[PDB]
Amino acid sequence: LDPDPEFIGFINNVTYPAGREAILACSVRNLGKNKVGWLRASDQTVLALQGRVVTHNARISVMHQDMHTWKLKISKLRESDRGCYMCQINTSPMKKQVGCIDVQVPPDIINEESSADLAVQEGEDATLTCKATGNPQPRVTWRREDGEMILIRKPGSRELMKVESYNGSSLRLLRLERRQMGAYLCIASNDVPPAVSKRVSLSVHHH
Ligand SMILES: *[C@@H]1O[C@H](CO[C@@H]2O[C@@H](C)[C@@H](O)[C@@H](O)[C@@H]2O)[C@@H](O[C@@H]2O[C@H](CO)[C@@H](O)[C@H](O)[C@H]2NC(C)=O)[C@H](O)[C@H]1NC(C)=O
């Protein structure tokens, strides 16, 4: 009774920022004549079998540095690499363990959902919006490029109040004065560097 292959540990779920090299580790004992492969769990396509990488994906590699551990390696990690990967032993039936990769992604500003340069007549309201994406979800701050204070609603009231900056995707300017013209900068960050900014130029005329 020299027994069947068995998984020794488990593949821990991992988190990497984009651009790094993701490594998943799979440990098996008593492999014998059987084979260890990796598959992408989404589409069941074979990434590797034994020491051969079967996919044509140039970013995928496998390692086997000691006798009980098999590693899958994904270089230049992308959002599309997110998800679960399966270590499989070709027993009958197959034995499988699953490990999943959470890819942290630095923020993007979705330009086509965000404000372009605009002009308004003095007195109009204008909302400046930066819709940002990323993982974790970014936060957005607004400030004037020239460092001058921004006029926003005084909370609960109908009056306005000066602030150094505003935290939120939509900067809501009310009854604009001509001196509120100029460049507004929205900065999106989620602590996965770099942050990202969009410059929005506001013109205020007579109207
Ligand atoms: C390991 O991760 C899978 C995948 O879930 C994703 O990755 C996690 C690390 C985390 O970021 C989740 O928010 C992601 O959805 C886990 O399976 C998921 O479990 C949740 C809650 O039980 C469920 O809503 C999802 O549908 C599951 N997704 C899949 C693809 O199965 C799994 O539970 C994690 N394992 C351990 C031991 O923590």
Author numbering: 35 to 241
Give sentences copied directly from the paper behind this entry:
We have recently identified interactions between two groups of Drosophila IgSF (immunoglobulin superfamily) cell adhesion molecules with properties closely matching a neuronal chemoaffinity function: 21 Dpr proteins, named after the founding member Defective proboscis extension response, selectively bind nine proteins, now called the Dpr-interacting proteins, or DIPs. All 21 Dprs and nine DIPs are predicted to contain two and three immunoglobulin (IG) domains, respectively. Our previous work identified the first IG domains, termed IG1, as the domains mediating the Dpr–DIP interaction by the formation of a pseudo-symmetric IG1-IG1 heterocomplex using the GFCC’C’ face of the immunoglobulin fold. Therefore, Dprs and DIPs are strong candidates for a synapse specification or targeting function.
During our crystallization trials, we also grew crystals and determined the structure of DIP-γ IG1 +2 in a monomeric state. This has allowed us to compare three structures containing DIP IG1 and IG2 domains and the relative orientations of these IG domains. In all structures, the two IG domains are in an extended conformation. The extended conformation is due to lack of linker sequences between the two IG domains in DIPs, which also holds true at the predicted DIP IG2-IG3 and the Dpr IG1-IG2 boundaries. However, despite the lack of sizeable linker sequences, the DIP IG1-IG2 domain boundary is flexible, allowing for movement of the DIP IG2 with respect to IG1. This is a result of the lack of stabilizing influences such as calcium ions found in cadherin domain boundaries or hydrogen bonds between the domains observed in SYG-1 and SYG-2. Lack of rigidity in Dprs and DIPs might indicate that they may not serve as signaling receptors directly and may not relay force or connect to cytoskeleton.
